[PDB]
Design an enzyme around this catalytic site. Structure first.
Site, short mmCIF file in Angstrom:
data_model
loop_
_atom_site.label_atom_id
_atom_site.label_comp_id
_atom_site.label_asym_id
_atom_site.label_seq_id
_atom_site.Cartn_x
_atom_site.Cartn_y
_atom_site.Cartn_z
N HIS A 45 45.68 161.97 13.69
CA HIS A 45 47.07 161.57 13.30
C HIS A 45 47.13 159.99 13.11
O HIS A 45 48.18 159.56 12.83
CB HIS A 45 48.11 161.95 14.31
CG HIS A 45 47.96 161.09 15.57
ND1 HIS A 45 47.38 161.54 16.74
CD2 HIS A 45 48.53 159.82 15.80
CE1 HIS A 45 47.56 160.58 17.75
NE2 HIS A 45 48.25 159.56 17.16
N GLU A 59 35.84 142.96 18.69
CA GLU A 59 37.22 142.52 18.95
C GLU A 59 37.46 142.62 20.45
O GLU A 59 37.26 143.67 21.03
CB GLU A 59 38.22 143.32 18.12
CG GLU A 59 39.72 142.88 18.28
CD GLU A 59 39.93 141.59 17.52
OE1 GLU A 59 39.18 140.66 17.78
OE2 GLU A 59 40.73 141.54 16.55
N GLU A 69 33.81 138.71 15.95
CA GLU A 69 34.49 139.75 15.12
C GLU A 69 33.68 139.96 13.82
O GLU A 69 33.07 139.05 13.18
CB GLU A 69 36.02 139.66 15.04
CG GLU A 69 36.94 139.41 16.23
CD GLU A 69 37.06 137.88 16.53
OE1 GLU A 69 36.08 137.18 16.37
OE2 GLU A 69 38.13 137.38 16.82
N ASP A 93 42.58 167.16 16.65
CA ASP A 93 43.14 165.87 16.26
C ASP A 93 41.94 164.89 16.25
O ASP A 93 41.64 164.13 17.19
CB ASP A 93 44.30 165.47 17.22
CG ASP A 93 44.88 164.05 16.96
OD1 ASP A 93 44.61 163.53 15.87
OD2 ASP A 93 45.60 163.54 17.93
N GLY A 186 49.47 153.21 20.45
CA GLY A 186 48.40 152.15 20.08
C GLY A 186 47.06 152.39 20.85
O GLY A 186 46.08 151.85 20.45
N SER A 188 46.03 155.63 20.98
CA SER A 188 45.55 156.77 20.15
C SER A 188 44.28 156.57 19.31
O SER A 188 44.10 155.48 18.76
CB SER A 188 46.50 157.17 19.06
OG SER A 188 47.65 157.71 19.76
N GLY A 189 43.39 157.61 19.35
CA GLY A 189 42.20 157.51 18.63
C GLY A 189 41.13 156.78 19.28
O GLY A 189 40.01 156.82 18.81
C1 FR1 Z 1 48.86 156.98 19.83
O1 FR1 Z 1 48.59 155.73 20.26
C2 FR1 Z 1 49.70 157.76 20.93
N1 FR1 Z 1 49.73 159.20 20.58
C3 FR1 Z 1 50.73 159.64 19.92
O2 FR1 Z 1 51.54 158.86 19.42
C4 FR1 Z 1 50.83 161.18 19.66
C5 FR1 Z 1 50.86 161.31 18.15
C6 FR1 Z 1 51.74 162.57 17.89
C7 FR1 Z 1 52.78 162.64 19.01
N2 FR1 Z 1 52.12 161.89 20.07
C8 FR1 Z 1 52.57 161.79 21.36
O3 FR1 Z 1 51.88 161.23 22.21
C9 FR1 Z 1 54.00 162.33 21.68
N3 FR1 Z 1 53.86 163.68 22.19
C10 FR1 Z 1 54.78 164.52 21.91
O4 FR1 Z 1 55.78 164.11 21.29
C11 FR1 Z 1 54.41 165.91 22.29
C12 FR1 Z 1 54.02 166.26 23.57
C13 FR1 Z 1 53.72 167.55 23.84
C14 FR1 Z 1 53.81 168.57 22.89
C15 FR1 Z 1 53.60 170.01 23.29
O5 FR1 Z 1 53.56 170.28 24.47
N4 FR1 Z 1 53.48 171.05 22.32
C16 FR1 Z 1 53.00 172.34 22.87
C17 FR1 Z 1 52.93 173.76 22.21
O6 FR1 Z 1 53.12 174.69 23.05
O7 FR1 Z 1 52.68 173.92 21.00
C18 FR1 Z 1 54.14 168.26 21.60
C19 FR1 Z 1 54.46 166.92 21.32
C20 FR1 Z 1 54.57 161.31 22.74
C21 FR1 Z 1 55.98 161.50 23.26
C22 FR1 Z 1 54.51 159.90 22.18
C23 FR1 Z 1 49.43 157.66 22.49
C24 FR1 Z 1 50.68 158.18 23.20
C25 FR1 Z 1 48.28 158.47 22.95
C26 FR1 Z 1 49.77 156.74 18.52
F1 FR1 Z 1 50.75 156.18 18.89
F2 FR1 Z 1 49.28 156.04 17.57
F3 FR1 Z 1 50.10 157.80 17.92
CA CA Z 2 40.05 138.25 18.20
#
Ligand code: FR1
Ligand code: CA
Length: 240
Positions: A45, A59, A69, A93, A186, A188-189
């Site tokens: 995502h 970095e 860098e 994902d 931030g 994520s990934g």
């Molecule tokens: C990353 O840094 C960031 N991850 C996320 O942003 C991800 C991307 C998609 C939504 N994300 C969440 O972490 C959000 N989670 C939810 O909104 C969520 C939680 C749980 C479920 C679920 O239980 N479904 C179950 C089923 O039974 O099907 C769905 C959705 C949260 C709130 C923010 C970090 C957080 C890791 C980046 F931000 F870039 F995305």
């Molecule tokens: Ca730097």
């Protein structure tokens, strides 16, 4: 990473910052791990979107010149064929990104080690998350790489109703879930580095945390289990 500490400049050399064009300048939006010198592993995502991507290896401070860098464009995005943007909780994902030229390796730039296909960690495994993501819910990005000790919570426990229930599956890994330390947006990934037979290897890619917040008791950070996607990785890279 909420409740972290800043990492030493050479501890976690496979860490990458994935950035977009933001326009006039660039903006970190996720983490990644260097897995070949022209290939990086991040979350499907973080590349969901129509933006221009670059990656920065070596970095430590996202601001500030480090002296270490290298900045390299992304040529090619391969998302898991089953990822569906609507549904983080289905899993898949995961994405690989072909860089425009290979980086050179040194003491700040190194390849990530990947687990054997199929491996699963015991409960309460020693593992670190690292990243520049928010250091509080609804806060701000770190300027410096942070890391936080997050041991694993195994599938049956993370699976139980008091924790994620249903929403976790077994193509995923839970780690943390103490209320104090966690992934956050931030991060994520990026990698989840676990210690196994004396070497750190990357067993998760950071996916998701809960809507009530980043560091919530009993809702551990959840990650893609790398060890379920070994064969997919190697088949992509083979192919390009
Ligand atoms: C990353 O840094 C960031 N991850 C996320 O942003 C991800 C991307 C998609 C939504 N994300 C969440 O972490 C959000 N989670 C939810 O909104 C969520 C939680 C749980 C479920 C679920 O239980 N479904 C179950 C089923 O039974 O099907 C769905 C959705 C949260 C709130 C923010 C970090 C957080 C890791 C980046 F931000 F870039 F995305
Ligand atoms: Ca730097």
């Amino acid at each position: 990473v909420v409740g972290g500490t800043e990492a030493q400049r050479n501890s976690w050399p496979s860490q990458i910052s994935l950035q977009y064009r933001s326009g006039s300048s660039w903006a970190h939006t996720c983490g990644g791990t260097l897995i070949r010198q022209n290939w990086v592993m991040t979350a499907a995502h973080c590349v969901d979107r129509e933006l221009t991507f670059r990656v920065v290896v070596g970095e430590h401070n996202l601001n500030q010149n480090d002296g270490t860098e290298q900045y390299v464009g992304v040529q090619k995005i391969v998302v898991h064929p089953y990822w569906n943007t609507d549904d983080v909780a289905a899993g898949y994902d995961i994405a690989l990104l072909r860089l425009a030229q290979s980086v050179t390796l040194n003491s700040y730039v190194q390849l990530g080690v990947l687990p054997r296909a199929g491996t699963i960690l015991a409960n309460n495994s020693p593992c670190y998350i690292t990243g520049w993501g928010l250091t509080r819910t609804n806060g701000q990005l770190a300027q410096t790489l942070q890391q936080a000790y997050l041991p694993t919570v195994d599938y049956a426990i993370c699976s139980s109703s008091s924790y994620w229930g249903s929403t976790v599956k077994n193509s995923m890994v839970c780690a943390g879930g103490d209320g104090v330390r966690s992934g956050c947006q931030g991060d994520s990934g990026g990698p989840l580095h676990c210690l196994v037979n004396g070497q750190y290897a990357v067993h998760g890619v950071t996916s998701f945390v809960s809507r009530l917040g980043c560091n919530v008791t009993r809702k551990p950070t959840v990650f893609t289990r790398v060890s379920a996607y070994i064969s997919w990785i190697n088949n992509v890279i083979a192919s390009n």
